[PDB]
Amino acid sequence: IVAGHMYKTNWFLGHSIKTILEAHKGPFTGEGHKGLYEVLTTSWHAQLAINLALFGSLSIIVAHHMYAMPPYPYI
Amino acid sequence: SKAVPFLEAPKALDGSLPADVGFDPLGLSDIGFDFTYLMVPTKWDESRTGLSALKWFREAEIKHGRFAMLAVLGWVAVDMGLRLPVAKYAGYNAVQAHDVFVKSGDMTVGLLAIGFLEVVMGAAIYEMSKGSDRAAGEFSFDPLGLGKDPSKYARYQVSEIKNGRLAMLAFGGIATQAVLTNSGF
Amino acid sequence: VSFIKPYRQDPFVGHLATPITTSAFTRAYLKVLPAYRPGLTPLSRGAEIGFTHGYFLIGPFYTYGPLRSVEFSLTSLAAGLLAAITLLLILTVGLSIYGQVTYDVYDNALIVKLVRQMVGSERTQDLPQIKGTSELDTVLGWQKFSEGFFSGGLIGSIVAAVGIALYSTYL
Amino acid sequence: ERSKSLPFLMKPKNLDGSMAGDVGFDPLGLSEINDVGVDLYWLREAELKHCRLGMMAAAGILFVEILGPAPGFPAGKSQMDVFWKVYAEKPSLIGASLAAIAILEVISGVATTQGRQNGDRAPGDYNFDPLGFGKDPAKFKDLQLKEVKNGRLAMIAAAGMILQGVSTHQGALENLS
Amino acid sequence: LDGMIGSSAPFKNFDPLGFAAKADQKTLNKYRESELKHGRVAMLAVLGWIVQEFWHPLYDGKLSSNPLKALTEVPLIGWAQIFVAINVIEYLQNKIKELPGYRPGDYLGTWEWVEQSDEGWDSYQTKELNNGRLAMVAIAGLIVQDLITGQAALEQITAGNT
Ligand code: CLA
Ligand code: CLA
Ligand SMILES: C/C(C=C=C1C(C)(C)C[C@H](O)C[C@@]1(C)O)=C/C=C/C(C)=C/C=C/C=C(C)/C=C/C=C(/C=C/[C@@]12O[C@]1(C)C[C@@H](O)CC2(C)C)CO
Ligand SMILES: CC(/C=C/C=C(C)/C=C/[C@@]12O[C@]1(C)C[C@@H](O)CC2(C)C)=C\C=C\C=C(C)\C=C\C=C(C)\C=C\[C@@]12O[C@]1(C)C[C@@H](O)CC2(C)C
Ligand SMILES: CC(/C=C/C=C(C)/C=C/[C@@]12O[C@]1(C)C[C@@H](O)CC2(C)C)=C\C=C\C=C(C)\C=C\C=C(C)\C=C\[C@@]12O[C@]1(C)C[C@@H](O)CC2(C)C
Numbered sequence: 201i202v203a204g205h206m207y208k209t210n211w212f213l214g215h216s217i218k219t220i221l222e223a224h225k226g227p228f229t230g231e232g233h234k235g236l237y238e239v240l241t242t243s244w245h246a247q248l249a250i251n252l253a254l255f256g257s258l259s260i261i262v263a264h265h266m267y268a269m270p271p272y273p274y275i
Numbered sequence: 276s277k278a279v280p281f282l283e284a285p286k287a288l289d290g291s292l293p294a295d296v297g298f299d300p301l302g303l304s305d306i307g308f309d310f311t312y313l314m315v316p317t318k319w320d321e322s323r324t325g326l327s328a329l330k331w332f333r334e335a336e337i338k339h340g341r342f343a344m345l346a347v348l349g350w351v352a353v354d355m356g357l358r359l360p361v362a363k364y365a366g367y368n369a370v371q372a373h374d375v376f377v378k379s380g381d382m383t384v385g386l387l388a389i390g391f392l393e394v395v396m397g398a399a400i401y402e403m404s405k406g407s408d409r410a411a412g413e414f415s416f417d418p419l420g421l422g423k424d425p426s427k428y429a430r431y432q433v434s435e436i437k438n439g440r441l442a443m444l445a446f447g448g449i450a451t452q453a454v455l456t457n458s459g460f
Numbered sequence: 461v462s463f464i465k466p467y468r469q470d471p472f473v474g475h476l477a478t479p480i481t482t483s484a485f486t487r488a489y490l491k492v493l494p495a496y497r498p499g500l501t502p503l504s505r506g507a508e509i510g511f512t513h514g515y516f517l518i519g520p521f522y523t524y525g526p527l528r529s530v531e532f533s534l535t536s537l538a539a540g541l542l543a544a545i546t547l548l549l550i551l552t553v554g555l556s557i558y559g560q561v562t563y564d565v566y567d568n569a570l571i572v573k574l575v576r577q578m579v580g581s582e583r584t585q586d587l588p589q590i591k592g593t594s595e596l597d598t599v600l601g602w603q604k605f606s607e608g609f610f611s612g613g614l615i616g617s618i619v620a621a622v623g624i625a626l627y628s629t630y631l
Numbered sequence: 632e633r634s635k636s637l638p639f640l641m642k643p644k645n646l647d648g649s650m651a652g653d654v655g656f657d658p659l660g661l662s663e664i665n666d667v668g669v670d671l672y673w674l675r676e677a678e679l680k681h682c683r684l685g686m687m688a689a690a691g692i693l694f695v696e697i698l699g700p701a702p703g704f705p706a707g708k709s710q711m712d713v714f715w716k717v718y719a720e721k722p723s724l725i726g727a728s729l730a731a732i733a734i735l736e737v738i739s740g741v742a743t744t745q746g747r748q749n750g751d752r753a754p755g756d757y758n759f760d761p762l763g764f765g766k767d768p769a770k771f772k773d774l775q776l777k778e779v780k781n782g783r784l785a786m787i788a789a790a791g792m793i794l795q796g797v798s799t800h801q802g803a804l805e806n807l808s
Numbered sequence: 809l810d811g812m813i814g815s816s817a818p819f820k821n822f823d824p825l826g827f828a829a830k831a832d833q834k835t836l837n838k839y840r841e842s843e844l845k846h847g848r849v850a851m852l853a854v855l856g857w858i859v860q861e862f863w864h865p866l867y868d869g870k871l872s873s874n875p876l877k878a879l880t881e882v883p884l885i886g887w888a889q890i891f892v893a894i895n896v897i898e899y900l901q902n903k904i905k906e907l908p909g910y911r912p913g914d915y916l917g918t919w920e921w922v923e924q925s926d927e928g929w930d931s932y933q934t935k936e937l938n939n940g941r942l943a944m945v946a947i948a949g950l951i952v953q954d955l956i957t958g959q960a961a962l963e964q965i966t967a968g969n970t
Binding site (some may be wrong): 211212 | 316318
Binding site (some may be wrong): 462464465477479482483484485486487488489491492584615631 | 869885899900901903904907910914915916917918920921922925928953
């Protein structure tokens with residue numbers, strides 16, 4: 201719930217993901233994350249790539265933590 | 276300046292505020308931080324030009340003075356008796372009445388009521404930051420009407436701020452000494 | 461600032477000027493290595509490379525060979541030394557055949573200029589072309605390089621065996 | 632330019648004079664909210680519903696505590712605890728009342744949103760004047776003011792009664808004396 | 809005490825004793841080299857001091873956690889290898905120093921890419937210099953405290969010998 205009050209939606213409050221990404225440049229990375237917001241807001245395939253990769257990784261992490269710490273009675 | 280003559284002036288203590296003598300050795304009246312942002316963290320309004328730290332400090336000083344005056348009145352009252360005409364307020368001094376009443380669920384009620392009033396008048400402070408003509412500490416509270424005759428108003432202003440400074444220091448002493456003029460350590 | 465730029469102001473090379481390819485540390489470190497150290501004959505480069513390589517090659521053979529010993533054994537040291545020397549021989553054979561099939565030159569940094577000046581209307585690839593101007597890029601240069609590698613490998617392997625024996629005995 | 636209730640505050644922009652009980656008491660500027668389907672219309676409808684609910688609840692508590700319960704109903708003088716005694720013996724009454732209130736509240740929300748959309752219905756208006764007590768104007772404004780003031784007072788009263796019953800587990804006038 | 813990098817807010821161009829007001833460019837380059845080397849060595853020394861105090865996995869434990877005591881417990885053949893590695897590194901640094909366009913403390917050769925330095929590059933160089941200075945003071949204090957008291961950093965702090 202706390203983490204949900206981060207991004208600016210309809211009031212003068214919160215963050216703009218465009219401003220966060222565009223400020224993360226560096227000597228080794230040129231323009232940095234400039235344009236990534238446009239990539240992820242105009243391409244469903246990029247969002248699917250990120251979400252599916254992290255989702256599969258999360259599934260594997262879930263699999264590990266399941267047997268590691270059994271969360272159900274008599275399982 | 277008119278006090279501490281070997282320091283000229285802070286920078287903003289021109290004299291536009293009442294009870295001004297120029298005493299500010301540390302130059303605290305020049306911080307660029309608009310303390311209204313401690314209330315409204317964001318600019319919120321596009322018309323929020325900003326509030327000078329000096330005006331916020333004047334409002335805080337007036338509020339502190341009023342609080343300290345009422346506080347010393349109350350602390351002196353409970354040293355010489357003067358309990359409320361109701362049960363559960365027997366005699367338990369002032370160094371221990373605070374805790375026993377925090378236990379008995381009414382200091383929470385006082386906190387809620389004082390917070391309600393503080394929120395309303397802090398909305399007043401925020402409107403002042405937005406750019407209302409209201410001056411610091413001016414809640415337009417003159418029911419009995421001894422506030423007309425602008426000369427009388429200015430004299431009563433300087434009187435209130437000086438009395439508030441005296442009461443702040445006196446309350447600090449009283450709480451530190453645990454009272455000596457009317458009770459014992 | 462940007463620490464990655466096109467190499468030598470050529471945006472079309474398959475290379476980049478990163479803080480690793482063209483850093484001052486990289487420059488000095490590669491210029492002190494025997495392969496690129498200035499003032500070394502090809503025989504000297506080969507000798508130094510062979511010494512270092514035999515020196516660090518005797519290690520794995522002696523330590524993990526088929527005749528190891530948790531204590532010091534002369535047989536284990538001899539086995540490791542012989543294996544290292546034979547591996548150096550195999551590497552020298554590879555160097556010799558590579559140099560035999562790669563270059564046809566006996567004096568470089570000139571033939572290129574001669575064919576850039578006095579014309580090269582011949583079968584090419586010996587008069588013209590010629591990749592690299594180093595003395596290592598000749599038939600004579602590579603032969604001496606291989607000879608130095610082989611001799612230095614033997615000497616370095618023997619020196620490392622002596623050092624291993626001394627360390628295992630007197631420590 | 633200054634709010635009538637709070638002279639140290641500027642007049643809240645959305646509260647001019649129209650609504651009954653308007654004295655400019657909006658220190659937090661909540662009347663200017665125009666998001667999450669919440670505006671002055673929705674806030675006024677919520678205030679009127681709260682006023683009516685608090686009036687009914689305060690009247691019910693006072694009636695039951697003073698004149699006693701109806702025949703066949705439990706006693707105890709603690710209105711926050713007698714509810715569980717009624718539910719323990721007449722659960723169907725509570726369930727039917729809840730279902731009726733749910734249906735009426737769905738209708739109320741639909742009416743509020745519709746009247747907000749195609750402005751023809753004042754906030755809190757349900758055309759409920761069976762006895763014709765507010766037909767003519769110049770009395771409707773007075774009745775609106777009376778209802779708003781009584782509803783705010785009864786809101787405060789009912790919240791107090793709820794908290795007193797939950798904490799002290801005693802009757803309202805029992806706490807009074 | 810020049811347009812050199814390393815001037816921060818508390819004391820801009822901090823040369824109270826005027827060491828740089830009379831020195832030429834070569835002496836100032838030498839001073840910057842010495843300062844940067846001391847700062848880097850001191851940062852490493854402080855980090856090692858603390859980490860060794862609360863973690864010494866190598867040498868199968870042992871090697872008493874108090875520094876200036878493990879200094880006399882290393883096999884003394886591992887001391888030789890560390891010495892030789894530092895020596896080879898500084899030989900490479902000496903070779904770097906003759907590369908064209910060399911800057912006093914720059915062993916990465918950033919002058920190859922950084923022409924017309926920015927404010928971020930200068931600020932980061934100043935950050936490195938200031939951290940190095942703080943680490944020099946800290947390591948001097950660490951060694952002196954361990955000498956006079958006999959306890960290490962987190963040991964003296966834990967007991968309360970302050
Ligand atoms: C800073 C002001 C202040 C504070 C915090 C207190 C706090 C206290 N007083 Mg007290 N008192 C004060 C000033 C103050 N007094 C003054 C100025 C007088 C003289 C008039 C008294 C006279 C007095 C008596 C005679 C008694 C107390 C008692 C008490 C204690 C019991 C009350 C309690 O539990 O909280 C209750 C909640 C509060 C006190 C919070 C105050 C909330 C107020 C009521 C809201 C309204 C304020 C008012 C409208 C301000 C107007 C300004 C503006 C609107 C124009 C408590 C420790 C009793 C006790 O047993 O003490 C040992 C007691 O018998 N006081
Ligand atoms: C001036 C630097 C310095 C020096 C002289 C020492 C000296 C010592 N350390 Mg040590 N250490 C250092 C920094 C240093 N440390 C730092 C920065 C860390 C944090 C990673 C550690 C972590 C550490 C542990 C965990 C242990 C020691 C231990 C020891 C002792 C045995 C030697 C050993 O195994 O080292 C081991 C050293 C490491 C594992 C990390 C060294 C990494 C180096 C300093 C960074 C790279 C150096 C590079 C080659 C040159 C820089 C390149 C460029 C800048 C020019 C010896 C007294 C051991 C001991 O007996 O403790 C009492 C032990 O178990 N150290
Ligand atoms: C989406 C929605 C509805 C809608 C819509 C539509 C349908 C889409 C139409 C429009 O287009 C939009 C919109 C948004 O309006 C939302 C529904 C509303 C909700 C979520 C309902 C919440 C009601 C909760 C209440 C009112 C509960 C009160 C509890 C009490 C407890 C009483 C006690 O006695 C108990 C039980 C125990 C005792 O010991 C003591 C106490 C504690 C006093 C007092 O009463
Ligand atoms: C230090 C202080 C003020 C110091 C002022 C100074 C130095 C002023 C100096 C000058 O003016 C002179 C001299 C001359 C001028 O020309 C120059 C200056 C420089 C301007 C106030 C302290 C002020 C300190 C205060 C007010 C502390 C209050 C503590 C309280 C009230 C405790 C309340 C309790 O609740 C608890 C915490 C626990 C409960 O169980 C019990 C109780 C006791 C009830
Ligand atoms: C929903 C309802 C009651 C619901 C009660 C519930 C859920 C209670 C459930 C529980 O108690 C139990 C069971 C057991 C407990 O352990 C659990 C709970 C949960 C506590 C009653 C509706 C009751 C509904 C009634 C009585 C409807 C009457 C309708 C009439 C007279 C209609 C007339 C018309 O249709 C004509 C004739 C012609 C049309 O043209 C015009 C009109 C006028 C519309």
